[PDB]
Amino acid sequence: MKEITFKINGQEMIVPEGTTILEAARMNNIDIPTLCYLKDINEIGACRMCLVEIAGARALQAACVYPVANGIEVLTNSPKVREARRVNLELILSNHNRECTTCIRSENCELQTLATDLGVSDIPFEGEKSGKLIDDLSTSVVRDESKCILCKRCVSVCRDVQSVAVLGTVGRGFTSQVQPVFNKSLADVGCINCGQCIINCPVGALKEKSDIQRVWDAIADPSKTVIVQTAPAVRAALGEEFGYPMGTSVTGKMAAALRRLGFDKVFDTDFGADVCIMEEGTELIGRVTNGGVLPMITSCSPGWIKFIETYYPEAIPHLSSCKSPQNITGALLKNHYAQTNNIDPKDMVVVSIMPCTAKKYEVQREELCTDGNADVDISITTRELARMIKEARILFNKLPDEDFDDYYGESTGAAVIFGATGGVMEAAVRTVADVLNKKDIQEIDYQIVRGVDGIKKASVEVTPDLTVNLVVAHGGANIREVMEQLKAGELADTHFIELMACPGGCVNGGGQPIVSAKDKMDIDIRTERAKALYDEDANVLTYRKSHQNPSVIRLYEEYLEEPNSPKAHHILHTKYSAKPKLV
Amino acid sequence: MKEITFKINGQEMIVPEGTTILEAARMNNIDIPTLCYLKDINEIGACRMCLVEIAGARALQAACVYPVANGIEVLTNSPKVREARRVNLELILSNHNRECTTCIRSENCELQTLATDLGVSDIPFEGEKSGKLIDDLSTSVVRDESKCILCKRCVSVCRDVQSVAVLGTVGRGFTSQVQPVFNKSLADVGCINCGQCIINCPVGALKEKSDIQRVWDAIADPSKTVIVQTAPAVRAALGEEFGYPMGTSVTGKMAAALRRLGFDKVFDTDFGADVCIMEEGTELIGRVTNGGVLPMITSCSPGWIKFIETYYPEAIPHLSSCKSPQNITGALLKNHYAQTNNIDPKDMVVVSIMPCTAKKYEVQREELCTDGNADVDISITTRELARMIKEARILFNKLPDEDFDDYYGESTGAAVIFGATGGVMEAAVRTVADVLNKKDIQEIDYQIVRGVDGIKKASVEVTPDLTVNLVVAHGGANIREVMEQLKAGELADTHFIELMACPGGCVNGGGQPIVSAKDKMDIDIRTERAKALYDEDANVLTYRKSHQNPSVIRLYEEYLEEPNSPKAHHILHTKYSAKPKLV
Amino acid sequence: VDVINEVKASGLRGRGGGGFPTGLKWQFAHDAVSEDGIKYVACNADEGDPGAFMDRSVLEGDPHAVIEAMAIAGYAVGASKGYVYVRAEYPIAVNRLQIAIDQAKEYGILGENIFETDFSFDLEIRLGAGAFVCGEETALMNSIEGKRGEPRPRPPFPANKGLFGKPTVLNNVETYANIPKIILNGAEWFASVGTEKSKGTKVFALGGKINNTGLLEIPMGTTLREIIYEIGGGIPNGKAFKAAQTGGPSGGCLPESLLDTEIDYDNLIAAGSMMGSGGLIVMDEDNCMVDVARFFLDFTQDESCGKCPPCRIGTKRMLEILERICDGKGVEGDIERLEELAVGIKSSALCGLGQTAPNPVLSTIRFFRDEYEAHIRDKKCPAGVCKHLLDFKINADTCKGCGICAKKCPADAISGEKKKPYNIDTSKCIKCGACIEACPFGSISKA
Amino acid sequence: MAELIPVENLDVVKAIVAEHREVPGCLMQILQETQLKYGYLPLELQGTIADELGIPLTEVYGVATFYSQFTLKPKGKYKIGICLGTACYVRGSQAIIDKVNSVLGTQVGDTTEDGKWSVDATRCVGACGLAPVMMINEEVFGRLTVDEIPGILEKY
Numbered sequence A, B: 001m002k003e004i005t006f007k008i009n010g011q012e013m014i015v016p017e018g019t020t021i022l023e024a025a026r027m028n029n030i031d032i033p034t035l036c037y038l039k040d041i042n043e044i045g046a047c048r049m050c051l052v053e054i055a056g057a058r059a060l061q062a063a064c065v066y067p068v069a070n071g072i073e074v075l076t077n078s079p080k081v082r083e084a085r086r087v088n089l090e091l092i093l094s095n096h097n098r099e100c101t102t103c104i105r106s107e108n109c110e111l112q113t114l115a116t117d118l119g120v121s122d123i124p125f126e127g128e129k130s131g132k133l134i135d136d137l138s139t140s141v142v143r144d145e146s147k148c149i150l151c152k153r154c155v156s157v158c159r160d161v162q163s164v165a166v167l168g169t170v171g172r173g174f175t176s177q178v179q180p181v182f183n184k185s186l187a188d189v190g191c192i193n194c195g196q197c198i199i200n201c202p203v204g205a206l207k208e209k210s211d212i213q214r215v216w217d218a219i220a221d222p223s224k225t226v227i228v229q230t231a232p233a234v235r236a237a238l239g240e241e242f243g244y245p246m247g248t249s250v251t252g253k254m255a256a257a258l259r260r261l262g263f264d265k266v267f268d269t270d271f272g273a274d275v276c277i278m279e280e281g282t283e284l285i286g287r288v289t290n291g292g293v294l295p296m297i298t299s300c301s302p303g304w305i306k307f308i309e310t311y312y313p314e315a316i317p318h319l320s321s322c323k324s325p326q327n328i329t330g331a332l333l334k335n336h337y338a339q340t341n342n343i344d345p346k347d348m349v350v351v352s353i354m355p356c357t358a359k360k361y362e363v364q365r366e367e368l369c370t371d372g373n374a375d376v377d378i379s380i381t382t383r384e385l386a387r388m389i390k391e392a393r394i395l396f397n398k399l400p401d402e403d404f405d406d407y408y409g410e411s412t413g414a415a416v417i418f419g420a421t422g423g424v425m426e427a428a429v430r431t432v433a434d435v436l437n438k439k440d441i442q443e444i445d446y447q448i449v450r451g452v453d454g455i456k457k458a459s460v461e462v463t464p465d466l467t468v469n470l471v472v473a474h475g476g477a478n479i480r481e482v483m484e485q486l487k488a489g490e491l492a493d494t495h496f497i498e499l500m501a502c503p504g505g506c507v508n509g510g511g512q513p514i515v516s517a518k519d520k521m522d523i524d525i526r527t528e529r530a531k532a533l534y535d536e537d538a539n540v541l542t543y544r545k546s547h548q549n550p551s552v553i554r555l556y557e558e559y560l561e562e563p564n565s566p567k568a569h570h571i572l573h574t575k576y577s578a579k580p581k582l583v
Numbered sequence C: 001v002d003v004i005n006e007v008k009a010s011g012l013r014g015r016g017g018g019g020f021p022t023g024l025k026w027q028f029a030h031d032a033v034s035e036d037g038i039k040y041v042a043c044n045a046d047e048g049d050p051g052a053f054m055d056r057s058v059l060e061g062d063p064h065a066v067i068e069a070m071a072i073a074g075y076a077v078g079a080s081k082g083y084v085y086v087r088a089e090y091p092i093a094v095n096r097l098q099i100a101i102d103q104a105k106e107y108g109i110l111g112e113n114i115f116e117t118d119f120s121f122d123l124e125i126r127l128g129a130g131a132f133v134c135g136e137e138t139a140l141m142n143s144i145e146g147k148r149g150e151p152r153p154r155p156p157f158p159a160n161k162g163l164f165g166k167p168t169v170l171n172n173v174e175t176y177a178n179i180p181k182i183i184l185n186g187a188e189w190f191a192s193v194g195t196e197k198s199k200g201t202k203v204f205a206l207g208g209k210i211n212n213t214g215l216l217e218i219p220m221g222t223t224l225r226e227i228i229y230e231i232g233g234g235i236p237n238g239k240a241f242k243a244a245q246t247g248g249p250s251g252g253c254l255p256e257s258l259l260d261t262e263i264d265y266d267n268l269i270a271a272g273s274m275m276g277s278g279g280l281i282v283m284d285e286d287n288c289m290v291d292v293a294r295f296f297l298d299f300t301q302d303e304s305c306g307k308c309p310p311c312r313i314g315t316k317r318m319l320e321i322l323e324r325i326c327d328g329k330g331v332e333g334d335i336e337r338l339e340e341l342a343v344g345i346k347s348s349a350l351c352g353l354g355q356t357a358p359n360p361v362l363s364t365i366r367f368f369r370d371e372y373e374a375h376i377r378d379k380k381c382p383a384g385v386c387k388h389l390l391d392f393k394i395n396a397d398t399c400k401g402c403g404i405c406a407k408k409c410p411a412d413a414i415s416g417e418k419k420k421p422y423n424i425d426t427s428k429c430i431k432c433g434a435c436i437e438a439c440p441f442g443s444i445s446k447a
Numbered sequence D: 001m002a003e004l005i006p007v008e009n010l011d012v013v014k015a016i017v018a019e020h021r022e023v024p025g026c027l028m029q030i031l032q033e034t035q036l037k038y039g040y041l042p043l044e045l046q047g048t049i050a051d052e053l054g055i056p057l058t059e060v061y062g063v064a065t066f067y068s069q070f071t072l073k074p075k076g077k078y079k080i081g082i083c084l085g086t087a088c089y090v091r092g093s094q095a096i097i098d099k100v101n102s103v104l105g106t107q108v109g110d111t112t113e114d115g116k117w118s119v120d121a122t123r124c125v126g127a128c129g130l131a132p133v134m135m136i137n138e139e140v141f142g143r144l145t146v147d148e149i150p151g152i153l154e155k156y
Ligand SMILES: *O[C]1[C]([C]OP([O])(=O)OP([O])(=O)O[C][C]2O[C](N3[C]=[C][C]C(/C([N])=O/[C@]45=NC6=[C]C([C])=C([C])[C]=C6N([C][C]([O])[C]([O])[C]([O])[C]OP([O])([O])=O)C4=NC(=O)[N]C5=O)=[C]3)[C]([O])[C]2[O])O[C](N2[C]=NC3=C2N=[C]N=C3[N])[C]1[O]
Pocket: C013, C014, C015, C016, C017, C018, C019, C020, C021, C022, C024, C025, C028, C044, C045, C046, C047, C048, C049, C135, C136, C137, C138, C157, C158, C159, C170, C171, C172, C173, C175, C250, C274, C275, C276, C277, C351, C352, C353, C356
């Protein structure tokens, strides 16, 4: 590692070869405007707005992509730099729609903040805008190319960290636009509805398909009973919308807020998570002892399920037959709770609140229905929950703490670690070891693999006669690589493979509140969200294992008989089919 | 006291007679949108936005001005209420000018917040708006008529609080506007440039004059030396603009930020404050021992001196001849510092940072010139200082602590306590008691006159042969009342009178950052800012008295000889004259 | 107290339009308690609705019955001074009422020791300046107080907090006109006339295209067919009856489809109108309903004070859309926009003037939608009233082709030869209408 | 008709305000008397009145500009008022207003150059039983046609 000496505004530093002016300023209490800058994702130098004067140069230089040299002199607050910045800002703002009052972003937009900071008093440049057409036809994502500023962050996000590549650029001059392949819609092409490009946009040209009106109509119907389902990772990041410091659990306040909205019943997904863990453990035992298909892969998250149905139909045998936990809870409420409470299966509405934007399409599928009825009717994200709370306008900072309802409100830490990455396999290994040997494990050490970061491997000895091999992966590129090596035949010894679409797990989903680069550089958000989830796991003083929950024990004793029973196979199991691709 | 029992949305509780439903909902964790309602200032029911459904009523009723009765039934989230609120917001937004990117208020506008909260998707109602008339002719206050929503807050602030009444309503219908009389401008009517109407506007039609370009041009001149001076109350409220909590002092970070802009010298005004205290005590002694014109009144704040010059001229003899601390410091730097450092007085620029907008008018006065040269050239407010920090873009959250520059940077607690009301009186009493009788006074017991808030009466016995009578007043109505009491002959035995125009002292000046009614109904801002100033006062471990400052005694023993010397009368004193009013 | 009970038993309800019983209003004023034991009586004579003038007629015909009810109300509620609010632009009525009060105080009726009793009552005449919005029932209070005529929210109702914060009784003059009969003859006489919900008789001032115009003392519940035909004399010139507007610009329009409807408080509000000021305007076939809707909306637009955003902004947004319909530039989809505007303004207006502003449009849209569709789609005015939509066509069999209209055409749109019928270019002229008036043979027709 | 006092004299208004100061809510009454006497309400007279009444000019200017019947500019010798009530509207007073505009050579709400003719669109005088209705000072004409407008105007 060669050491390079440089000066920023007369302050000297030895640095590794290849540091930028912007990074040094950030670590030395100086800030420089950026629009098209993402760390490790977007280094394109296209927005042309981070210009910093360098002595002896013909013109100004962009700091985000300028490698520091030996003995250069740097000026930042000279009048020429400010004039160039304001001219560039008013030039870019000449095509944008200035209807800040009717934007969903509004308060937290990058362009609004930069315009307010730089003090652009007037817009002297007038003319015509670029063509506007809203693709409000896809299931979960909506493009609004009238607000696009062509920073190319969405393209790089979809190509690099997701390995899907369903976006590109077309045209020249004013006609240049970022569009999907062959002038089609995102519901027609090989998109997996993960929703990362939505949370990686600076101005708000990408949004979600809002379904708040359906919920509002459902609440006001006197003949319908409304039951809401709460995700485990929606209580780890909601506080952002209400000024709370990050890493704070808002379980009681969130429950109280949902009870004040007029919901008839409130339940948690953790019951379905425990049921799913039990079913997957029983399936693992059955496949191991009867020579089943190995390795066995959990199939909870819809994202990579769509990914594998679209791209890798060869290995669809390997998927588990169980449903996602929220589908388990919905089907159970629609059948057993309906029978117990003398309520017609068609006379109740169940809505789920999940940080994912692929569950909007997941619930919409026609196959995931029980007895001719939809398991889950409506699904809304965390941002839509915050918008609903703000529209109802209840003070969220002064709410007391309230408890969940019985019996689907009973929770275990095995289903609280479930939201973060590595929690599903953690709970599965704990439960299977306890069942098979009474072997008490609490944490698993995961090996960091050289060359590829984010893919995890472990090997815990369950029985002296059986050691199990484990693989955990999150992120599109990691799933691509692990599926490629599985097809190549290098994973014959593997037993468990867990795959998550969104990098970092469901704590970094597509429906979580959006943070800018400023708040992103200070703290890695996924790590401390997972830390908050683990701390909540350490604060659960009742039961730390899934099979010790009295609710699931009573359920299996009264209705479900034994795991993997014919009734359980009929109710909680579904099949998967390949989907054609049009890219 | 009659006790009214009532239920709101299913919660029963006891109020005194006359309690509006909005207060009960807010203090019982229910929030309702509001635009035209201020505490004890504006209860007119004009905005028509806080509509709440009442069972058995003909139509929706306004919550903010609704007295509650026994046994009512209230619902706040029927679909009719939401639809009516949305329609009303879309109706109000049809006349507003909607260039939020080029609006000075922007990030903290109430209209933008309400538009974002309620979800205004589309604006169906077009048409022609009321004419635009920007009054860019006054020195301190500027009006943009295209942004007004006719909420009528400024009228009540200028009529009931300041008791000046230079604003009214003219016309009917779309021809109705808020205007001064005669169809003139504010510079032609008897305004006092207090600035309360600016900080009490909810959308930002009222702004202050911008002198940032003059400062930027002054800094860019290589042949000009620039000296900035800081007010004592700016550092008790500036941190609020950078995310710091309520009532935090940012002295070191302020010094570092000011040094980073490029100012040649940075100084604090407390030096001139101590000089002014010494001179005023000297005139006290001179007038008492010679039977001069009594009671004495101060000459510090330009607002009420303009009030005297406009409304009550026969009291000009009662005024003190000493200049304001800002003018004292400016003239002293223009003469003594220039002589010491051999710098041309005409090649220097002095800029001050104060929480007032009337200081912009004080600078314009011709009579405050020394040797044909103006004392202070450019004056700016706190908001402009924060905007300059944001445009120069230094991370104010991570500056290291620093100190002021010698010798004019030394400060004492008696000069720090000026910001809150009662500080000048306390400092003057302290210094005069120490000089005359070696009496160590620390606090002053204030007696509040029954029925009136803002007037304080006390009596301190400095010597057995001289008991000093004291009067303190803040707010326009209190100044008017004490002036009536003086002109009626009821103030014959008084010795000191202190008058401030803005209510609660300069900590609540028109140059401070704007806080909406949300945080304004939570915490008393004047009380907490005064608490911060007093806490900073209690931690000055070097010197707590004015005459004990080494810098002032060095100055008096080297340059100014003795207080009220011919040189002091020539440099630090000025005269006042009456001015014509056109109301 | 016995007077209050008798008035309540008489079933007398205020004919101002809101239909609130005067007995309850008097009771709520009587049971209130003031700080200094001072109570007032104020009265409304500010008629503002066009086409109705009974309020001035009762003053100029018999002011003694007006002022006796003043003292009756003052004795009933314990008020020692009273006020009257009459427009200053009616000099004859003001002079007659001041001569009447002068005679009454000369005889000793008004002043101290009224008829050798312990009740003393005094009257001061307030001279209004004639503003429709000032005719509102809190704006009148503010005008008497000397401030702007901007209305106040209620509650506190004027029965509890009136003049200078003291309880005060407010009623219209023609309501007071009937109390001598109640006192002298008994409540059963009033209860014997009219229906169960509303008792007595009512004054109707009628106008428009009618053979005979004037005022009628009609029993409560009389049908409109009897008023228009038996008493009104029928439609003049044999024209086709379309509708009668009731309640003025704050009321509605009743077509022939409900001509047999009983006229009362409940039936009118079920039909989309109300009593209003008591004025009726009957109109015949020559009328275009879009134009009269625009006029009835413009009247309220020009009279809005501007305090609350609905009545200030939405009225002009409604005026603009009707203007563009009248000018022929309108497009489809305006009907639901009008519906949304009316429902929004109806439920969120501080003042009662802005609540009933969209009422005529609501009455017309539910009954005459085909005219709106013809104006929007066919671009044709059936009545030939919309200036920019009608076409001037000459009759070749009658036109002499003299060319007088050609010379009088300001846009140079008429061309032709002598002794031969001319031709009219519609796209050229601005449809001023001078050519049809300049024609001596009357050969030009509007289509 | 009494002669209108020139606005330069400030003693008559002082006498009026001194005589009528004790009456509650006397602002409107004093404004009507000054309008009747002086002919109109200029800003200087308004300031003077606010000076003796001890009231800021905001209230006086607002209450005088609130009522359309308080004039801020001088008027002509004769005032023309066309009844725009419902009864006059249905009979066709719009053509009457158009003829008045054509003949008078001035628009609605404008004062003629000679100071002799003034037109105003009064909503209702009260004689709505004789539509169409016209008012010239103290004379009222009812049941008018288009052709009679020049004939009636020639009388004045
Ligand atoms: O008394 C009182 C009452 C109240 O009322 P209501 O019922 O609620 O209602 P209203 O407000 O009334 O409604 C409205 C109506 O009206 C009518 N109209 C129309 C047009 C015109 C007219 C007239 N003429 O008149 C006056 N004006 C006006 C105007 C306007 C715009 C308005 C809105 C109003 C008015 N007004 C009214 C008044 O204020 C009253 O109402 C009366 O006065 C009463 O009396 P009588 O006798 O009638 O009954 C008026 N007025 C007069 O007089 N004048 C004139 O001019 C009208 C139509 O139809 C519409 O719709 O009641 C009572 N209350 C209530 N609540 C209560 C009470 N009391 C006690 N307690 C309680 N809680 C009061 O007091």
